[PDB]
């Protein structure tokens, strides 16, 4: 165990994330109640692996749109997307299998639940048919299932409480394509964060929320 953790921090440092995911996979299966550290390593691993694709993805899609040739591009995006479904598919089972099932506290549960919604969400970013839908749904049910715990077991300023809010609110506006319900979740989350402002991780999230509004309020 101590090795994969370590071997993981290497892949991190080295910035060889895909390999960072593996060392972590090992860690999870090689297991009890996964530790904050490991938890936050498995994420960052998947965060980056996945992240790299969405980025490659968007630009691509962005270039594809411009053209309208397009044939080839789509081909590429095809290849790319394929990768997405993978990482997503990967992290998800690991969620259902080992992670969630063990959760013994708010953060943990709120944390994972949150993850489970995010990748389901990422799946919603490019899927088009039955999948696309079952995702949006799965997204919603996931975040909501989390929100019930956070808004109740976590302080309105707690990073997670905030982290969830932010993404959830990007799920609505961007996935379900319904600006209204989003903003409220945004603003609501933001306000009740203030009403108790009396750090660093939270503060940086509250900032992203305001940016989302002012941005969603300007189209």
């Amino acid at each position: 165990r101590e090795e994969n953790v370590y071997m993981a921090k290497l892949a991190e440092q080295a910035e060889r994330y895909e390999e960072m995911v593996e060392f972590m996979e090992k860690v999870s299966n090689s297991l009890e109640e996964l530790t904050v550290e490991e938890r936050n390593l498995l994420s960052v691993a998947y965060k980056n692996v996945i992240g790299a694709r969405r980025a490659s993805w968007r630009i691509i899609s962005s270039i594809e749109q411009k053209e309208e040739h397009v044939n080839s591009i789509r081909e590429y995006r095809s290849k790319i997307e394929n990768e997405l479904s993978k990482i997503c598919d990967g992290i998800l089972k690991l969620l259902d299998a080992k992670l969630i099932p063990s959760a013994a506290s708010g953060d943990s549960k709120v944390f994972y639940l949150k993850m489970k919604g995010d990748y389901h969400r990422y799946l919603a970013e490019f899927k088009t048919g039955a999948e696309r839908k079952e995702a949006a749904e799965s997204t919603l049910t996931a975040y909501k299932a989390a929100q019930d715990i956070a808004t109740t077991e976590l302080a309105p300023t707690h990073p997670i409480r905030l982290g969830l809010a932010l993404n959830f609110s990007v799920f609505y506006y961007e996935i379900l394509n319904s600006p209204d319900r989003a903003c409220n979740l945004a603003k609501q989350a933001f306000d009740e964060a203030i009403a108790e402002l009396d750090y660093k991780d939270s503060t940086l999230i509250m900032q992203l929320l305001r940016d989302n509004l002012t941005l969603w309020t300007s189209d």
Binding site: A55, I59, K66, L166, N167, V170, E174, I205, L208, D211
Partner: protein
């Protein structure tokens, strides 16, 4: 920080450097 810890920030960095003159791809801020 924003271009360090968000898909949106990163995307905006790359696209600028790449001189990519394609037009804004809308996106919000997701952790």
């Amino acid at each position: 920080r924003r271009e360090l810890h968000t898909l949106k920030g990163h995307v905006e960095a790359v696209v600028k450097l790449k001189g990519l003159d394609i037009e804004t791809i809308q996106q919000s801020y997701d952790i």
